[PDB]
From Swiss-Prot:
The keyword Hydrolase does not apply. Belongs to the ATG8 family. InterPro entries: Atg8-like (IPR004241), Ubiquitin-like_domsf (IPR029071). Keywords: Autophagy, Cytoplasm, Cytoplasmic vesicle, Cytoskeleton, Lipoprotein, Membrane, Microtubule, Protein transport, Transport, Ubl conjugation pathway, Vacuole. The gene is ATG8F. It is found in: Cytoplasmic vesicle, Autophagosome membrane; Vacuole membrane; Cytoplasm, Cytoskeleton. GO terms for cellular component: autophagosome; autophagosome membrane; cytoplasmic vesicle; microtubule. Residues 118-121 form a propeptide. Ubiquitin-like modifier involved in autophagosomes formation. May mediate the delivery of the autophagosomes to the vacuole via the microtubule cytoskeleton. SUPFAM superfamilies: Ubiquitin-like. This is Autophagy-related protein 8f. Its main location: membrane. Constitutively expressed. The record marks 117-118 as: Cleavage.
């Protein structure tokens, strides 16, 4: 209902392994799986999945998306997961190991705001 991707393509072995493999490896980079929300209207960003360092926060991950993906000036991005709205400033890292975790891999879903929805080509 909230996100849509991994639920269609399950592969814990991959998530679990890559998760513990990285935390054991050294980089300790936050595995972020960006996915388009159901009511998402912010298309352009190559979401899919990619490992992002834990040396940053939630809003930093947002800063990663940097709302430069055909986004508007005064506007920005917004993430929804499991019907939530992360602290966007906390710390995807600590957070990853303090509240939200499934194995070590982090799954997120992006969504925009009053970005694009007027006239399409």
């Amino acid at each position: 209902m909230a996100k849509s991707s991994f639920k269609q393509e399950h592969d814990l072995e991959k998530r679990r392994a890559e998760a513990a493999r990285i935390r054991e490896k050294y980089p300790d980079r936050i595995p972020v799986i960006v996915e388009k929300a159901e009511k998402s209207d912010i298309p352009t960003i190559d979401k899919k999945k990619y490992l992002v360092p834990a040396d940053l926060t939630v809003g930093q991950f947002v800063y990663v998306i940097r709302k430069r993906i055909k986004l508007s000036a005064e506007k920005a991005i917004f993430i929804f997961v499991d019907n939530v709205l992360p602290p966007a400033g906390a710390l995807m890292s600590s957070v990853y190991e303090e509240k939200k975790d499934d194995d070590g891999f982090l799954y997120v879903t992006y969504s925009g705001e009053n970005t694009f929805g007027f006239g399409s080509p």
